[PDB]
Write a protein that binds this DNA or RNA. Structure first.
Ligand SMILES: [Mg+2]
Ligand SMILES: [Mg+2]
Ligand SMILES: [Mg+2]
Ligand SMILES: [Mg+2]
Ligand SMILES: [Mg+2]
Ligand SMILES: [Mg+2]
Ligand SMILES: [Mg+2]
Ligand SMILES: [Mg+2]
Ligand SMILES: [Mg+2]
Ligand SMILES: [Mg+2]
Ligand SMILES: [Mg+2]
Ligand SMILES: [Mg+2]
Ligand SMILES: [Mg+2]
Ligand SMILES: [Mg+2]
Ligand SMILES: [Mg+2]
Ligand SMILES: [Mg+2]
Ligand SMILES: [Mg+2]
Ligand SMILES: [Mg+2]
Ligand SMILES: [Mg+2]
Ligand SMILES: [Mg+2]
Ligand SMILES: [Mg+2]
Ligand SMILES: [Mg+2]
Ligand SMILES: [Mg+2]
Ligand SMILES: [Mg+2]
Ligand SMILES: [Mg+2]
Ligand SMILES: [Mg+2]
Ligand SMILES: [Mg+2]
Ligand SMILES: [Mg+2]
Ligand SMILES: [Mg+2]
Ligand SMILES: [Mg+2]
Ligand SMILES: [Mg+2]
Ligand SMILES: [Mg+2]
Ligand SMILES: [Mg+2]
Ligand SMILES: [Mg+2]
Ligand SMILES: [Mg+2]
Ligand SMILES: [Mg+2]
Ligand SMILES: [Mg+2]
Ligand SMILES: [Mg+2]
Ligand SMILES: [Mg+2]
Ligand SMILES: [Mg+2]
Ligand SMILES: [Mg+2]
Ligand SMILES: [Mg+2]
Ligand SMILES: [Mg+2]
Ligand SMILES: [Mg+2]
Ligand SMILES: [Mg+2]
Ligand SMILES: [Mg+2]
Ligand SMILES: [Mg+2]
Ligand SMILES: [Mg+2]
Ligand SMILES: [Mg+2]
Ligand SMILES: [Mg+2]
Ligand SMILES: [Mg+2]
Ligand SMILES: [Mg+2]
Ligand SMILES: [Mg+2]
Ligand SMILES: [Mg+2]
Ligand SMILES: [Mg+2]
Ligand SMILES: [Mg+2]
Ligand SMILES: [Mg+2]
Ligand SMILES: [Mg+2]
Ligand SMILES: [Mg+2]
Ligand SMILES: [Mg+2]
Ligand SMILES: [Mg+2]
Ligand SMILES: [Mg+2]
Ligand SMILES: [Mg+2]
Ligand SMILES: [Mg+2]
Ligand SMILES: [Mg+2]
Ligand SMILES: [Mg+2]
Ligand SMILES: [Mg+2]
Ligand SMILES: [Mg+2]
Ligand SMILES: [Mg+2]
Ligand SMILES: [Mg+2]
Ligand SMILES: [Mg+2]
Ligand SMILES: [Mg+2]
Ligand SMILES: [Mg+2]
Ligand SMILES: [Mg+2]
Ligand SMILES: [Mg+2]
Ligand SMILES: [Mg+2]
Ligand SMILES: [Mg+2]
Ligand SMILES: [Mg+2]
Ligand SMILES: [Mg+2]
Ligand SMILES: [Mg+2]
Ligand SMILES: [Mg+2]
Ligand SMILES: [Mg+2]
Ligand SMILES: [Mg+2]
Ligand SMILES: [Mg+2]
Ligand SMILES: [Mg+2]
Ligand SMILES: [Mg+2]
Ligand SMILES: [Mg+2]
Ligand SMILES: [Mg+2]
Ligand SMILES: [Mg+2]
Ligand SMILES: [Mg+2]
Ligand SMILES: [Mg+2]
Ligand SMILES: [Mg+2]
Ligand SMILES: [Mg+2]
Ligand SMILES: [Mg+2]
Ligand SMILES: [Mg+2]
Ligand SMILES: [Mg+2]
Ligand SMILES: [Mg+2]
Ligand SMILES: [Mg+2]
Ligand SMILES: [Mg+2]
Ligand SMILES: [Mg+2]
Ligand SMILES: [Mg+2]
Ligand SMILES: [Mg+2]
Ligand SMILES: [Mg+2]
Ligand SMILES: [Mg+2]
Ligand SMILES: [Mg+2]
Ligand SMILES: [Mg+2]
Ligand SMILES: [Mg+2]
Ligand SMILES: [Mg+2]
Ligand SMILES: [Mg+2]
Ligand SMILES: [Mg+2]
Ligand SMILES: [Mg+2]
Ligand SMILES: [Mg+2]
Ligand SMILES: [Mg+2]
Ligand SMILES: [Mg+2]
Ligand SMILES: [Mg+2]
Ligand SMILES: [Mg+2]
Ligand SMILES: [Mg+2]
Ligand SMILES: [Mg+2]
Ligand SMILES: [Mg+2]
Ligand SMILES: [Mg+2]
Ligand SMILES: [Mg+2]
Ligand SMILES: [Mg+2]
Ligand SMILES: [Mg+2]
Ligand SMILES: [Mg+2]
Ligand SMILES: [Mg+2]
Ligand SMILES: [Mg+2]
Ligand SMILES: [Mg+2]
Ligand SMILES: [Mg+2]
Ligand SMILES: [Mg+2]
Ligand SMILES: [Mg+2]
Ligand SMILES: [Mg+2]
Ligand SMILES: [Mg+2]
Ligand SMILES: [Mg+2]
Lengths: 122, 137, 10
RNA sequence: GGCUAAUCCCCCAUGUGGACCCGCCCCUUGGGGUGUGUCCAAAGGGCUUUGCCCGCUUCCGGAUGGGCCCGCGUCCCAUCAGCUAGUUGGUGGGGUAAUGGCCCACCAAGGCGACGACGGGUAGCCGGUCUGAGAGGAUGGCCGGCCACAGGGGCACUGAGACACGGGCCCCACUCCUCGGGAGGCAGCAGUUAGGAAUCUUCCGCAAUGGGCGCAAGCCUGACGGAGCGACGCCGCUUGGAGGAAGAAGCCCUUCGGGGUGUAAACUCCUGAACCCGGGACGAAACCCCCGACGAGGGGACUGACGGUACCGGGGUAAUAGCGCCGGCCAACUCCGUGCCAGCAGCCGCGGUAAUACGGAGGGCGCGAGCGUUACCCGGAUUCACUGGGCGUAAAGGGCGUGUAGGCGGCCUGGGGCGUCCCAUGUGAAAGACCACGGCUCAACCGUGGGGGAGCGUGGGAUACGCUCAGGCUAGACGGUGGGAGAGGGUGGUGGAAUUCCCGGAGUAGCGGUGAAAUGCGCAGAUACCGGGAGGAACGCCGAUGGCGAAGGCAGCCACCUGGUCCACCCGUGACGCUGAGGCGCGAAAGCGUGGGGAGCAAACCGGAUUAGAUACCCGGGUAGUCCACGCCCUAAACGAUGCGCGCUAGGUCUCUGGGUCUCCUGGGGGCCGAAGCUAACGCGUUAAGCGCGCCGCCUGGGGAGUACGGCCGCAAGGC
RNA sequence: UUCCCGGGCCUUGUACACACCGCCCGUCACGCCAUGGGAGCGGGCUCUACCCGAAGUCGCCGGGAGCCUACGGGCAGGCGCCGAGGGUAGGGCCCGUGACUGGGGCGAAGUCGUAACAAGGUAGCUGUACCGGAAGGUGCGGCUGGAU
RNA sequence: AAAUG
């Protein structure tokens, strides 16, 4: 572009699209599970992954992943969630934070237990 | 022809790259003052006022390096690089403290000032700034 | 946001 | 309903002075100074008491705190393009400390906007803070500066100052107290509650600093000075230090020999966080008292919330470790379990029985009172590119002109000095940053100095380049005179070849068509042949790799109107130029409207074949349309997928059209191969995609999607 | 040596490279997500005209009439302009939501054919037009990013 | 002429 054109139209500053829309600014956000089921993932994986349809405090509803092996999460379980998606499960854009509200820690977990909300063992 | 000064600079730049002995440009007392620095700082042997078909020109006598060995005998250049700074589209002016150092002293910056056409070296001495005309090395 | 009877509403 | 004081209120006086009207002098917006008329002041209280102290009154200047006005700077959407009746200006007035349409009457018809008015969305702004090589981006919490608000709104009272957080009125919503209504306003300091992912003690003191009132002792101060909770952040410190086996057990690996944790431990000595005991602050010397004078000055005393705390001494116990990771980026490797399950995941990707990628374990790496995760900002992103990118084929040149604004612009001489450049000078608070010193045992934090800069006001200076005014020039540009080539454009006229149908003649058994066939046509006389008519549309040979046009596009021949353009001569004008958002015009085919026209051809449509099918390909039919006039539509592989003008950088060869001396030289077009150079390559290369300047248009991952919504255009189709 | 099966060398096209037993297109059936449209319904903001109108400053009155006096005056009191807001009516922008509907994205070891990439078996692509279960076909003109 | 994996 000529310099003149730049004086005229100027450069267009790029904008940023949040990948975590429902959070509405906040770091984490509280909610209740409406559905708790398993979803098969996209190719080339095969599994029955653990998810919850969750109703936010912003009166939103997101699909959120349940980490760990096994869970105490059910319909009507009050839960806390955090950002970050699960690439193989489209539409899952948030993770459940284990060890908060009616979300337990992973029983028998010994490695990297901060992530899985398990208190330090024997 | 919108910028006479760039033309000249480019006439030269174009000329050195096939290694013409010389090349003429249309005459101007300001084109001279610049050409003057170009020779006195040794980027050229020199120049002389001429005429073609009654038309004032400034024939510029070009300067080059020693022939080289290897698969490509073509010599190095005296003027490796000469390019406009200030342009009619965007005028460029520096103040004294803002006057740049070309290739770490190894080359010059011509600039038009209220005290004539000078080099970067020259301006910082006379303590002035001006329209930064171009950079050469 | 009304659920089957949960005192939690959302 | 009545009594009474004062620094409360009023009248007369006094008048240094001041206010006002009018004249005049200086000045120059309503600044000073005069003259005459007239108009205005006042408050006393104290002690030791022929005197000083706090008050009061009018005026003048200073100082500090302000009000108002102006220049420039300040976010996203143009899918917001028009906005405005106090609106813009004038006249007179009201109002104020004061200018002003601030308010009013009247008069004129103005004011604003692509340099983005109006409208919508978002935001208190700056010093600064964060990041960044910088340029820039992001941000404005704490502290300092200004503004704005005090439940939601309107108002004015008092006053130097308010239209007043803990003052007043009125309306609203809400809550509260027990029938007339009276009540409230934590966005002060704590505290409650709701909301939330989350955000503190209903602490201590006026000792310090600082504020109000007071002659003064002193009173008030949830400003403040301290303390409390919270690893929230940074900074300091600890859980030990020296010795200790060719090396305990346990656990992990193994080639069964061994290898690892690991000097690690155990065990030895030495130290001595915590804790006890004692002493124990700086922060605090002023006001006050005393001499002198209640001044200068010298001397007295008083008071510490934090606090029995820091800190300084005496004793003195070995005294918490966790978190993340170990496929690649990326530092850290091995067993078992599992078997596309369970699971990991930031991206590429791991798991299907031998997984360094899942879960445990041994071991290892990395940081450590922390380690990680989520969110957001800058970075890497030269991925909005000023520094510092691009568009033939990767995303990207507008289908083509003409031109408004704008941006940009040859040579020479001078005037101004606007940009530009130098110097002086003012400003640029403090804190923060930077360098140096210094104070808490260092540090964090804190003091004291030093360096300042951008930017703007002012004064001086310079004049190359940009600007501007003024003078000349001929190289750009445009004309004159003469001459050229050409399917350039418009109207009209008109010539032959062929297809078809019709008439006539002659003739007979098939013609047609395909891969092969069939449908079709044919004894009602087809085809093939001869003659004559009618009619529409396209112009063979010339014909080319050619020519013309800005593009679309233009082809028999003629005449007429008419554009572009090349050449020669070197006559004329003297920079009159280049580009060009909008605007306007043109714009193949198809399609649309109203009339014509309709031979050949041919979407749709029928039929015959093929085929599993055959809504196709092939064959026999055939309607729009193709043609003309006028009006629309405005698309494209509208392509050189290459915007336009200029300057500059080897040539070789083919060709079209000009001028020359005609071997050839010289212009303008069209091709090919190629110097230098470019390019990711392919390729480009004086017809640049090379080297440069000017201006415009455009790109910023794929899909969604040239879709939706809005808006404009259109009869519609549909276009932008 | 035309054909069928396989092979050698040169060359050309390619969207193949799991290498033609390759790739790949559209409808239709199912599941999930987001969006447009939709008789409407709910809200937020906003503009115009008019009715009523508190407190309050400003202005007129202060008289059949009260109080004060400093009475050519003041105060009470009365009228008026404007005025928070309230009300009626009609517009503009934004958000939410809606029976139903349109296509879109993803999902997948479904159903149909095979449009495109080799001359892809009718060269392709294109603007437009008409037609068709679907890819697509055909007409007109255009491009080579096609022929070998 | 002649489909698919
Ligand atoms: Mg799989
Ligand atoms: Mg897999
Ligand atoms: Mg861990
Ligand atoms: Mg008395
Ligand atoms: Mg008096
Ligand atoms: Mg008026
Ligand atoms: Mg006036
Ligand atoms: Mg006035
Ligand atoms: Mg006004
Ligand atoms: Mg009028
Ligand atoms: Mg706001
Ligand atoms: Mg604000
Ligand atoms: Mg950047
Ligand atoms: Mg702040
Ligand atoms: Mg602040
Ligand atoms: Mg308010
Ligand atoms: Mg208020
Ligand atoms: Mg409130
Ligand atoms: Mg209020
Ligand atoms: Mg006062
Ligand atoms: Mg107040
Ligand atoms: Mg108030
Ligand atoms: Mg205020
Ligand atoms: Mg209050
Ligand atoms: Mg209260
Ligand atoms: Mg509070
Ligand atoms: Mg609290
Ligand atoms: Mg809560
Ligand atoms: Mg605090
Ligand atoms: Mg005090
Ligand atoms: Mg004090
Ligand atoms: Mg207190
Ligand atoms: Mg701490
Ligand atoms: Mg040791
Ligand atoms: Mg050994
Ligand atoms: Mg060992
Ligand atoms: Mg051992
Ligand atoms: Mg083994
Ligand atoms: Mg051992
Ligand atoms: Mg002290
Ligand atoms: Mg005395
Ligand atoms: Mg003690
Ligand atoms: Mg001790
Ligand atoms: Mg001991
Ligand atoms: Mg020990
Ligand atoms: Mg880590
Ligand atoms: Mg690392
Ligand atoms: Mg490694
Ligand atoms: Mg298992
Ligand atoms: Mg892991
Ligand atoms: Mg395996
Ligand atoms: Mg294994
Ligand atoms: Mg592992
Ligand atoms: Mg890993
Ligand atoms: Mg630390
Ligand atoms: Mg980033
Ligand atoms: Mg950078
Ligand atoms: Mg650039
Ligand atoms: Mg790029
Ligand atoms: Mg294009
Ligand atoms: Mg167009
Ligand atoms: Mg112009
Ligand atoms: Mg100009
Ligand atoms: Mg110029
Ligand atoms: Mg100047
Ligand atoms: Mg400062
Ligand atoms: Mg020190
Ligand atoms: Mg300092
Ligand atoms: Mg002139
Ligand atoms: Mg002529
Ligand atoms: Mg016919
Ligand atoms: Mg006949
Ligand atoms: Mg002609
Ligand atoms: Mg002449
Ligand atoms: Mg002349
Ligand atoms: Mg033009
Ligand atoms: Mg057209
Ligand atoms: Mg047509
Ligand atoms: Mg039609
Ligand atoms: Mg028609
Ligand atoms: Mg017709
Ligand atoms: Mg048929
Ligand atoms: Mg057919
Ligand atoms: Mg046919
Ligand atoms: Mg036919
Ligand atoms: Mg017909
Ligand atoms: Mg072409
Ligand atoms: Mg392209
Ligand atoms: Mg153009
Ligand atoms: Mg073009
Ligand atoms: Mg041409
Ligand atoms: Mg040529
Ligand atoms: Mg030629
Ligand atoms: Mg070439
Ligand atoms: Mg080369
Ligand atoms: Mg050439
Ligand atoms: Mg050439
Ligand atoms: Mg290129
Ligand atoms: Mg990008
Ligand atoms: Mg995208
Ligand atoms: Mg996209
Ligand atoms: Mg379209
Ligand atoms: Mg559209
Ligand atoms: Mg629309
Ligand atoms: Mg129609
Ligand atoms: Mg149409
Ligand atoms: Mg377009
Ligand atoms: Mg063979
Ligand atoms: Mg052989
Ligand atoms: Mg081959
Ligand atoms: Mg190949
Ligand atoms: Mg829907
Ligand atoms: Mg909808
Ligand atoms: Mg009414
Ligand atoms: Mg009214
Ligand atoms: Mg009276
Ligand atoms: Mg009103
Ligand atoms: Mg109203
Ligand atoms: Mg009301
Ligand atoms: Mg809606
Ligand atoms: Mg709706
Ligand atoms: Mg096809
Ligand atoms: Mg095909
Ligand atoms: Mg086929
Ligand atoms: Mg084909
Ligand atoms: Mg093809
Ligand atoms: Mg077509
Ligand atoms: Mg058809
Ligand atoms: Mg069917
Ligand atoms: Mg065709
Ligand atoms: Mg090809
Ligand atoms: Mg196949
Ligand atoms: Mg099939």
């Amino acid at each position: 572009p000529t310099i003149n054109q730049l004086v005229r139209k100027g450069r267009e500053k790029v904008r940023k699209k949040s990948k975590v829309p429902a959070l509405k600014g906040a770091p984490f956000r509280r909610g209740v599970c409406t559905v708790v089921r398993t979803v098969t993932p996209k190719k080339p994986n095969s599994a029955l992954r653990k998810v919850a349809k969750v109703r936010l405090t912003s009166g939103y509803e997101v699909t959120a992943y349940i980490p760990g092996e096994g869970h105490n999460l059910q319909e009507h379980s009050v839960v806390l969630i955090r950002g970050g998606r699960v690439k193989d499960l489209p539409g899952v854009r948030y993770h459940i934070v284990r060890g908060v509200y009616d979300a337990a820690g992973v029983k028998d977990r010994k490695k990297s237990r901060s992530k899985y909300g398990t208190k330090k063992p024997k | 022809l919108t910028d006479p000064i760039a033309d000249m600079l480019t006439r030269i730049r174009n000329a050195t790259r096939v290694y013409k002995e010389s090349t003429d440009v249309p005459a101007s007392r300001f084109k001279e003052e610049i050409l003057r620095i170009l020779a006195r700082e040794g980027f050229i042997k020199g120049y002389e006022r001429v005429d073609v078909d009654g038309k004032p020109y400034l024939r510029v006598y070009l300067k080059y390096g020693p022939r080289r060995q290897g698969p490509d005998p073509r010599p190095e250049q005296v003027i490796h690089h000469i390019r406009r700074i200030s342009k009619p589209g965007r005028r460029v002016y520096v103040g004294v403290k803002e006057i740049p150092r070309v290739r770490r002293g190894l080359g010059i910056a011509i600039l038009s000032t209220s005290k004539g056409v000078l080099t970067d070296r020259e301006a910082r001495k006379l303590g002035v700034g001006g329209e930064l005309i171009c950079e050469v090395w | 946001t009304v659920x089957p009877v949960x005192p939690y509403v959302x």
